[PDB]
Design a protein around this ligand. Sequence first.
Ligand SMILES: */C=C/C1=C(C)C(=O)N/C1=C\C1=NC(=C\c2[nH]c(/C=C3\NC(=O)C(C=C)=C3C)c(C)c2CCC(=O)O)/C(CCC(=O)O)=C1C
Ligand SMILES: *C(=C)C1=C(C)C(=O)N/C1=C\C1=NC(=C\c2[nH]c(/C=C3\NC(=O)C(C=C)=C3C)c(C)c2CCC(=O)O)/C(CCC(=O)O)=C1C
Lengths: 608, 606
Amino acid sequence: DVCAREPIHIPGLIQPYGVLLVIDPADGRIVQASTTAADLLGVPMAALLGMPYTQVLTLPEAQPFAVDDQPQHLMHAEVRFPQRATPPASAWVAAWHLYPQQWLVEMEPRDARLTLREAMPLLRSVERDPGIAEAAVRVAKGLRSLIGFDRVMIYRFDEEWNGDIIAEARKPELEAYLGLHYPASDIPAQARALYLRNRVRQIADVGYQPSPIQPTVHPQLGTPVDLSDVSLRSVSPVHLEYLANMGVTATLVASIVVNDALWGLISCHHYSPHFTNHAMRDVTDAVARTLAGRIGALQAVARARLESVLLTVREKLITDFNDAEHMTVELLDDMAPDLMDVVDADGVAIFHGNDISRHGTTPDVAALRRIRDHIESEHHEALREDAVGALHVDAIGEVFPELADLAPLAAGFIFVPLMPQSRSALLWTRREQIQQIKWAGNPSPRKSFDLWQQTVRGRARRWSPLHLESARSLRVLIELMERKRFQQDFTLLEASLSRLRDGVAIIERGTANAAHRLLFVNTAFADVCGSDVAELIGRELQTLYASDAPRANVELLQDALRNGRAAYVTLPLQVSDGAPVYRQFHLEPLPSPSGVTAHWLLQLRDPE
Amino acid sequence: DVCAREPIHIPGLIQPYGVLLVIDPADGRIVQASTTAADLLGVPMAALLGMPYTQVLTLPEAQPFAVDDQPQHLMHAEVRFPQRATPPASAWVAAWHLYPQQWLVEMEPRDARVTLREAMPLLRSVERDPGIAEAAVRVAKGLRSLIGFDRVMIYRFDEEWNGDIIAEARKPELEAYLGLHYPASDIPAQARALYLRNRVRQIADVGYQPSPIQPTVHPQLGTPVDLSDVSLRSVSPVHLEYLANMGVTATLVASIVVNDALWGLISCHHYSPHFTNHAMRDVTDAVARTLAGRIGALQAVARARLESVLLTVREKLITDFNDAEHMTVELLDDMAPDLMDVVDADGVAIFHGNDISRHGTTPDVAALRRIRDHIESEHHEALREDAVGALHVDAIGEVFPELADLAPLAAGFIFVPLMPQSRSALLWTRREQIQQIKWAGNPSPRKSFDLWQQTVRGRARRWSPLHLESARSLRVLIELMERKRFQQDFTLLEASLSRLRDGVAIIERGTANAAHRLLFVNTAFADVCGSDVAELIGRELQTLYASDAPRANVELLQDALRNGRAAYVTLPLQVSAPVYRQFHLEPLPSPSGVTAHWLLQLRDPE
Ligand SMILES: */C=C/C1=C(C)C(=O)N/C1=C\C1=NC(=C\c2[nH]c(/C=C3\NC(=O)C(C=C)=C3C)c(C)c2CCC(=O)O)/C(CCC(=O)O)=C1C
Ligand SMILES: *C(=C)C1=C(C)C(=O)N/C1=C\C1=NC(=C\c2[nH]c(/C=C3\NC(=O)C(C=C)=C3C)c(C)c2CCC(=O)O)/C(CCC(=O)O)=C1C
C-alpha cells in the first residue's frame, strides 16, 4: 500500500553506466542533462545546458524527428562526441525516445564480444515445446548459456500476485531458489505496471553512484522526467537494499506478458558486476516474447480441449438424467463418476427431501445434513446473495467456523441451488489438501531469505473458473428433479380427478377483456355436456349453460364469478341433441395467496 | 476436390535457384540429386550420383548426423564446393533435413544485404498495439519497407476456409486488392496443411525452368522425395498459371498460425523477379509469429471480457426469474432486454402452451408459431439429435427451405429446448444482415480478377460459440418454467380434490415392503373418519374401518388390492353408529399398465 506509493518512474536520477539528455523538439536544445553527460560529451554542465544537441552529436545512422501523439523509439545506433579529443576508450551507442513535447536520448557503451542468429535454435525449440514447465526450464538453461548469468529463473505470478520460481538454471556452487514462494509486496503494483511498458531492465552494479538529471524539473514545463522508457532509469533504493541483502551485484529481468498481462518474469542474477549490452538485451527480449507466446498458446489449446470434454460429460448427464422418468439407485450410481468429473470433485451428494445419495469420498449422511442445514441458515443469507450462481468454498473452516471439522472430506465444496429450503440440491466436495508453502523469508526489506515451510491445513484445491461454470451449467439437473417430481404428483392428482363420479371442472378467472375458461374437466363433467374432455378445455363457462336459462339463476352464478365469491344454482345445460338437462352448479372459490380468488372449483352433483 | 488431389509435396522437381541432394545416412553417398547439382558441385550427374557427400561439399558450421525417430532440421550454414576450380560467383549456404532413412540437403545463394536487429522496432510495436486490424496493417506497411516487395497483404481465412485481404501495403501506382474475397478452392486443403509444416515459402521467378531430382524415385527404397520441408520444392503449375495471369513474377508468403491453427497468410507480390535470402525469410517468420501472437492475445482478452459480462446478465436472469412466482406481463418486459443481451439477439419469443411473448425485433405470432411447428417436425428430427444443447441457424433459408421468407427478422435463431412438444420454449432471433462480398473473379485458374459484388441475403451475424454456450446455460429457465407450471397446477388440483363433497383418497401400493398406505386424503374423507387430514396421511388402508367388517366384503376389497384391479363394496368405518360407506376403489393408469396407485372414493350420502 505505502510501498506501492513510490514514484519509481520519475527518480530524477540515472545509472552512471550511461548518459541521458532531454532535448526540446522545437530548438533541438539540451534542456536537462545527467551529471555523467559533462565527462563524455566534453563540455561541462554549465554551457552543455541550453546547447543545441547537433554541436555534441555525431550520429552516422538515423536522426530524431517530430512525433504527433504516439511516441516513437529509435534503436541503439553509433554515437560520436565532436566537442572533445577522443573522449571514450570504448564504442558508444545512442537510443532515442521521441515524445511530442520532449526528446530523450540515452547513450551507453556498445561493449561488443557477444547473437540474434545464434538465439534462433533456442527460440525455435520453445515455439514447439509442450507444457509451460518444459519451455520455462528450456528458457532458463538456454538463456544462461546465451548471456553468461550466474543464475536465470522464471518467476510465475499467482492469483493473489505472489510469485513462485517455476524454473531455474544456476552455477552448480549456488544455493537453489527453485520452488521458493515470495509475497506480492516484493514487486508492488506500480512496478508491475511499469514492467508492461518497459519489458527489459538491467542493473549493471547494485549500489552504484546514481547520476542525477541536473535541472530535476523541466526548465519551462516544470515537470520531472518520466524515465519509464529510459533503460538507464535509477531503480528503487528499497529494491537495491533487497538485492544487496540477497548478495547480487548485477540484475537483468524481462517480463513474460501473456494476453496483455504480466504473467511472470525472467529474473537473472550475477554475483559480480555485469553490464548486458543492447545486443544481449534485445536477445533476452526475443526469448521473453517467444516464451510468453508459447505459454499463451498452450493455455489457449488447454482451455479449448478441457471445455469440450467437460461439455460432452455435461450433455450426457443432461440427456441420461432426462431420459429416465424414475430416478433408480443404479441410475445415480452410473451418473456419479461423470457428475464428479464435470466439476473435478472428490465426492458428490444428491438431495431430494430428507434423502441423500452420497458418492465418491464425502462426509457421512449426518455431516452432509449438518453442512446443508448450515448453508440454508438465516445467519448465512448474505453468502447466497454475494455468491454468483453456485455457493463454493475453498476452505470450509474459514467461511463456516462451526463446520471447522469435516475439513478432511469436505474442505471445499460447490453447493447448488442458491435458493433456500428447495427440496432438490447438489453438493460437490473436495477433500483437504495439506499445502506446503516454501517461503523464502517469513511474512523496508527482509535481511534473511531462510526457508520457512508454512503447513496449511483445512483447505482444498482451488475451484477453477472452468469447473465453477461447469457447476452453474448443471443447475438444470436440480430443476429437472423438481419438475419431474411435480409432474409425477400432478398427473396422479389429474388421474384421480379425471376418474371421479361427481363431475368436476377447474375454472380460471378471466379479466375485464378476458372470460372465465375451463382449465381442467373430468370425464364425468364432459359426458353430461356431450363433448369430449379435450374439446371442452379452454371453453368459456358461459357456453355450458343453455342460452335459455332464467335471468335470476344465471345472474346468481355471474355475481359470484364477478365478485370472486361462491354460488349454488340449478341451471339447464346446452343440449347437443335434445332432452333438457338441468344440473345444480356448485361453484366454490379456491384459495389464493392474496385471498383474491384466481380459480374456482365447479362441481355438478351426479344424481343418485 | 480435383485441386487438393494434386500431391504438391512429391513433384520430383525443384526451383532452379538452388541445389538438392538426397543422401543415404549409412554410406553418406548421394542417392538422388537435382540436375542443378552437377553445374555447382563440379562433378556431372554421372559420377556425382552414388558419390560420398563429403567429397563434393565441405561444411565448416554444421554437419548432418543420425536421427532415431523425430527428424531434425539444421539451419542455413556456409557450404563450399571442393570438386570445382572456383565454382562460387556468389556465396552459398546449405540447410539439412535429417530423417531416419534419408538426409536431404538443400543449398541456395547467401545473397547478403540491419536485418533481425532492424525488425525489432516493428516486432515490439505490433505486440503493443490494440486490435487485429491495427497490427495487420502495421505488419503489411512495416514488412513492405523491411523486405522490399511491391505489395504485402494479410489474407485472413474465414469459417468456410475462404479468404479476405484485411490489410495491404503496395506501390502507390498499383491497383488495390484490399477487401477482396477469394474462394476456399484457391488454397486447397493439401496446400493449407503444408503451410502449417513449411512456415515460409518463396517463388523467386514465376515460370522458372524446374530442375528435376535425377532418380525420381529412391534407387533402393522406390519412393518419391517428400519435399514437404524443402524450401526449393517446385510449386504447382496451377498456382504458377494463376500467378502469371495476375502478372506477378515473384512471391513470398508466410503463415499466420494462431493457437496451432492456420489463421491466415502474409502474401507478398513482386512484379519483377526477386529471391528472398534465408535471412529475410527468417525475418518474415519472426513478424508472422509476432502478428500470430498479437491476434491470439487480443482474441483471448476479448473472450475473457465477454464471458464476464455474459455471466453477470445470466445470473441476473436466473435470480429475477426464480424470485417471481407469477409470470406477469411487466415481469417478461423487464427480463426481455437482458434475455436478448445474454445471447446478443435482436429479438426473443417466450413460449408456454399456445401463448407466445414476443420482444425486440421478431416475426409476428403467426410466423413464430410457423417456425416452432417446423422445428418440432418429424422430417426435421435429424437436426435436434445432431444439435448440441440448443438448435441454432445462421441462415434460416438454407436449413429450413419452407421458412425461406421470415429471414428479414428471423434469419438466424437459437431454439432451446431440443426436446419435441415440451410446453415451454425460448427462441432467440437475429435479423438479416446483408453482406456485400467483393469477389476478385466470379465462382484450372481464372484469367480475370474483375470486381463482382455479391449481395448476400438471408443470413444473420454468426452465433459465436460463446453466445451458444450462454444459450445452453439458460436451459435452466425452461425447466424453471416447467417446474413452476406443474407446481401451480398440482396445488390447484390438490386444493380442488380437498372439497368435492364425496370422500377422496389416493392409495399408494404396498409393493413388497409395507402395505397399501394413504398418499392423499381430502377434508370430506378425513371428517367421515374423524381424524384430521395430516394425521391420516401415511396410514394403512386396513387401519380406517374398525373390527366389525364382514369377511366377504373385506376379502372383495383385498382381492382388488392384491390383483391391482377395481372394486365396489359397502364397509363400516371407525365409529368415534358404525358409519357404513360405498368403498369405490378404481385403479389409476400406469406407464407399465401394472397399477401403482388407486383412487378411493366414498359417495357422500344424498
Ligand atoms: C517496497 C517493498 C519492497 C520489499 C519489501 C522488497 O523486497 N522489494 C520491494 C520493492 C520493490 N521491488 C521492486 C522490483 C523487483 N522486485 C523483484 C523481486 C525479486 N527479484 C528476484 O531476483 C527475486 C528472487 C530471486 C525476487 C523475489 C524483481 C525481479 C524486481 C524488478 C527488478 C528489475 O526489473 O530490475 C521495485 C521496483 C524497482 C524499480 O524497478 O524501480 C520496488 C519498489
Ligand atoms: C485450384 C487448384 C486452384 C485455383 C483455381 C487457383 O487459382 N489456385 C489453385 C491451386 C493452388 N493454389 C496454391 C497456393 C496458393 N494460392 C494462393 C492464393 C493467393 N495468393 C494471392 O496472392 C492471392 C491474392 C492476392 C490469392 C487468392 C497463395 C497465397 C498460395 C500459396 C503460395 C505460396 O505459399 O508460395 C497451391 C499450392 C502450391 C504449392 O505451394 O505447391 C495450389 C495447388
